[PDB]
Write a protein that holds these residues in place. Structure first.
Motif, PDB file in Angstrom:
ATOM      1  N   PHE A  10       0.832  -1.194   0.000  1.00 27.98           N
ATOM      2  CA  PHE A  10       0.000   0.000   0.000  1.00 27.98           C
ATOM      3  C   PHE A  10       0.874   1.254   0.000  1.00 27.98           C
ATOM      4  O   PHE A  10       1.326   1.701   1.057  1.00 27.98           O
ATOM      5  CB  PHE A  10      -0.914  -0.031   1.210  1.00 27.98           C
ATOM      6  CG  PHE A  10      -1.878   1.077   1.245  1.00 27.98           C
ATOM      7  CD1 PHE A  10      -2.991   1.044   0.434  1.00 27.98           C
ATOM      8  CD2 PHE A  10      -1.672   2.162   2.070  1.00 27.98           C
ATOM      9  CE1 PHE A  10      -3.895   2.066   0.454  1.00 27.98           C
ATOM     10  CE2 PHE A  10      -2.561   3.196   2.080  1.00 27.98           C
ATOM     11  CZ  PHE A  10      -3.683   3.141   1.274  1.00 27.98           C
ATOM     12  N   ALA A  11       1.106   1.829  -1.177  1.00 22.47           N
ATOM     13  CA  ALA A  11       1.872   3.063  -1.285  1.00 22.47           C
ATOM     14  C   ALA A  11       1.390   3.799  -2.520  1.00 22.47           C
ATOM     15  O   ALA A  11       0.974   3.159  -3.486  1.00 22.47           O
ATOM     16  CB  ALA A  11       3.365   2.782  -1.377  1.00 22.47           C
ATOM     17  N   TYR A  12       1.467   5.129  -2.505  1.00 21.45           N
ATOM     18  CA  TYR A  12       0.693   5.910  -3.457  1.00 21.45           C
ATOM     19  C   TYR A  12       1.205   7.342  -3.508  1.00 21.45           C
ATOM     20  O   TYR A  12       1.671   7.878  -2.505  1.00 21.45           O
ATOM     21  CB  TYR A  12      -0.778   5.872  -3.053  1.00 21.45           C
ATOM     22  CG  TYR A  12      -1.718   6.578  -3.973  1.00 21.45           C
ATOM     23  CD1 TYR A  12      -2.106   6.013  -5.174  1.00 21.45           C
ATOM     24  CD2 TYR A  12      -2.235   7.806  -3.627  1.00 21.45           C
ATOM     25  CE1 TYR A  12      -2.980   6.662  -6.002  1.00 21.45           C
ATOM     26  CE2 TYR A  12      -3.112   8.448  -4.437  1.00 21.45           C
ATOM     27  CZ  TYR A  12      -3.477   7.881  -5.624  1.00 21.45           C
ATOM     28  OH  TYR A  12      -4.340   8.572  -6.423  1.00 21.45           O
ATOM     29  N   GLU A  13       1.120   7.951  -4.689  1.00 18.24           N
ATOM     30  CA  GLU A  13       1.478   9.350  -4.894  1.00 18.24           C
ATOM     31  C   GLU A  13       0.493   9.984  -5.859  1.00 18.24           C
ATOM     32  O   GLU A  13       0.178   9.411  -6.901  1.00 18.24           O
ATOM     33  CB  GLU A  13       2.877   9.506  -5.477  1.00 18.24           C
ATOM     34  CG  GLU A  13       4.002   9.120  -4.567  1.00 18.24           C
ATOM     35  CD  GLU A  13       5.341   9.269  -5.242  1.00 18.24           C
ATOM     36  OE1 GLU A  13       5.361   9.563  -6.455  1.00 18.24           O
ATOM     37  OE2 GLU A  13       6.372   9.086  -4.566  1.00 18.24           O
ATOM     38  N   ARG A  40       6.867   7.851   6.964  1.00 18.35           N
ATOM     39  CA  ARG A  40       6.570   6.828   5.968  1.00 18.35           C
ATOM     40  C   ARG A  40       6.919   5.459   6.528  1.00 18.35           C
ATOM     41  O   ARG A  40       8.088   5.088   6.639  1.00 18.35           O
ATOM     42  CB  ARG A  40       7.337   7.081   4.686  1.00 18.35           C
ATOM     43  CG  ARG A  40       7.059   6.023   3.671  1.00 18.35           C
ATOM     44  CD  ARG A  40       7.744   6.309   2.373  1.00 18.35           C
ATOM     45  NE  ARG A  40       7.456   5.241   1.433  1.00 18.35           N
ATOM     46  CZ  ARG A  40       6.380   5.203   0.662  1.00 18.35           C
ATOM     47  NH1 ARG A  40       5.484   6.184   0.702  1.00 18.35           N
ATOM     48  NH2 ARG A  40       6.201   4.178  -0.152  1.00 18.35           N
ATOM     49  N   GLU A  42       6.899   1.417   5.956  1.00 19.47           N
ATOM     50  CA  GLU A  42       7.054   0.625   4.749  1.00 19.47           C
ATOM     51  C   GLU A  42       6.839  -0.866   4.939  1.00 19.47           C
ATOM     52  O   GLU A  42       7.104  -1.629   4.005  1.00 19.47           O
ATOM     53  CB  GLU A  42       8.449   0.833   4.152  1.00 19.47           C
ATOM     54  CG  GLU A  42       8.705   2.218   3.638  1.00 19.47           C
ATOM     55  CD  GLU A  42      10.086   2.353   3.044  1.00 19.47           C
ATOM     56  OE1 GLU A  42      10.872   1.389   3.155  1.00 19.47           O
ATOM     57  OE2 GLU A  42      10.387   3.415   2.462  1.00 19.47           O
TER      58      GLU A  42
END
Lengths: 48, 39, 148, 48, 48, 148, 148
Positions: A10-13, A40, A42
């Motif tokens: 789950f990571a997003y920009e 952040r 991870e």
């Protein structure tokens, strides 16, 4: 049991752009800033 | 200082799954995905 | 036992390949492990679809259609035949150290692709910027006349 | 004369899985080392 | 005489992101096409 | 500006490279964008660490220790200096077609790895099966004596 | 990427070994798997620390300081570098039978060791019984005079 097939990373920009009188303004954003986090992390995974 | 080196070298009783898979996936991190462009 | 729907097209192609040359008969006899005689290998083809598929892998010039028909009929002969038919290809000595020189650069391609969108979006943006200026001028003049 | 051989083959298949798994594992342990180095390098660059 | 040049460069930087992002983007569009074919084949084999 | 720990190793390096050969002076004047005089390029080096890293990249024999020391003391310059100092390698014509022959086989290696465990566990298992039999006898003999 | 602290000790040593002899260059090109040129294998060394450790193990005279400093600064490469670096320590034909004859002796050594204390206590007691009788007389004389 296999937890990795049934969980996801789950990571997003994302970024928002708007023109104000012939000038473009962009605003980036990250997922931890939305989730109430400051740092952040991870390692965390969402069950799908 | 109190050494713990003799206590350090132990082993955990390993026991097999019913289904294999997901083995070498312990330490991997891909880049964050982007959003679509907005207009 | 091989099914007759496959066998009708599978048997005479192998028979015609044997009538073309007998030098492949010793090859398929040493490959499957049956007797060198054509009647014995043809009986093995008729009695075992795995042996039939190994023969249709040894010859594939005319037996390609029969191979596809046995493929479409039986799936399990293919699931076993992919395992029984495996040749490890030759690897170059320079291959992995040659591939190390591209790490600096595939990263650059992906860092562009994440920004542009898809791979096709990157390729179309590259073509649109590499395109001629007169196409931009044609676009502007069709917009000047009132078209969109 | 082959009861000594088939028993060992079937005992190995009981441990591995199927006979297809035994054939594939024998091919992998017969395989050259350069392919293992190639898979290690693609994992090193970040490719699963 | 260079004000015609620098304002355009700063506008393209405001569009893309960082100046380093503009430099890497210009390099990626300047880059050869066989690298795009190679990355498409690595994505074809199942590697991301 | 530039850190003095970097400057004490970078300035005599560039000055000694100029004293060794003068043909690199016009080269770094064209690459960086300064005047061709050594006083001008040396003042540029003492003023800017990006310019200093570009000069220490253009001279490579006597400047590697100073370049790596600049990379130690200036962490902020690394990405910008790597982006400015970039040369794309040439690709072989047959590389992707030679790579496409190996897809059938890296999958075999990964299916072996999912059974064995780690990739390291596969390497160690292949070494143990390639190992001689006297080591198995030595293992059984040390366990026969009562040593574990 | 390799650390600059490791790179300062690693790159000039490899360059010096190549300048000393070029016969190692084809050897490390075949061992690692890169192109035979020093520029290509140096790019591989700078790119991958596993490749750096493999090269610093292949050149053995001058690369020990750089090898141990790489082992200090990259602790995570040690297991995989030990997996890749494995050579069969050749066993002797008489070693297992020569070893099996010493069970008679090691059991007695370990039992005397348990009676005394540690193996250090056994070695010190054996040295005390090996030491001269003049020392026993001298320490009796010191105990008679008052020196404990």
């Amino acid at each position: 049991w296999p937890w990795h097939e049934a969980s996801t990373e789950f990571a997003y920009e994302d970024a928002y752009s708007v023109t104000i009188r012939n000038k473009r303004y962009t605003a980036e954003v990250k997922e931890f800033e939305l989730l109430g986090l400051g740092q952040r992390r991870e390692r965390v995974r969402i069950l799908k | 200082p109190t050494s713990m080196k003799a206590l350090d070298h132990t082993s955990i009783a390993s026991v097999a799954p019913l289904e294999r898979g997901s083995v070498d996936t312990d330490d991997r991190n891909s880049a964050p995905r982007r959003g679509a462009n907005f207009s | 036992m091989l099914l007759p729907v496959v066998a009708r097209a599978a048997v005479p192609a192998i028979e015609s390949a044997i009538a073309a040359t007998p030098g492949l008969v010793s090859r398929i006899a040493a490959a499957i492990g049956s007797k060198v005689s054509p009647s014995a290998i043809l009986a093995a083809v008729k009695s075992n679809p795995v042996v039939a598929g190994l023969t249709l892998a040894q010859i594939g010039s005319t037996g390609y259609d029969a191979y596809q028909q046995l493929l479409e009929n039986h799936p399990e002969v293919a699931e076993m035949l992919k395992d029984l038919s495996f040749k490890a290809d030759e690897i170059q000595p320079d291959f992995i150290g040659n591939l190390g020189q591209y790490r600096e650069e595939l990263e650059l391609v992906e860092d562009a692709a994440r920004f542009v969108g898809g791979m096709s979006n990157l390729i179309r943006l590259r073509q649109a910027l590499e395109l001629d200026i007169k196409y931009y001028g044609l676009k502007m003049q069709l917009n000047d006349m009132g078209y969109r």
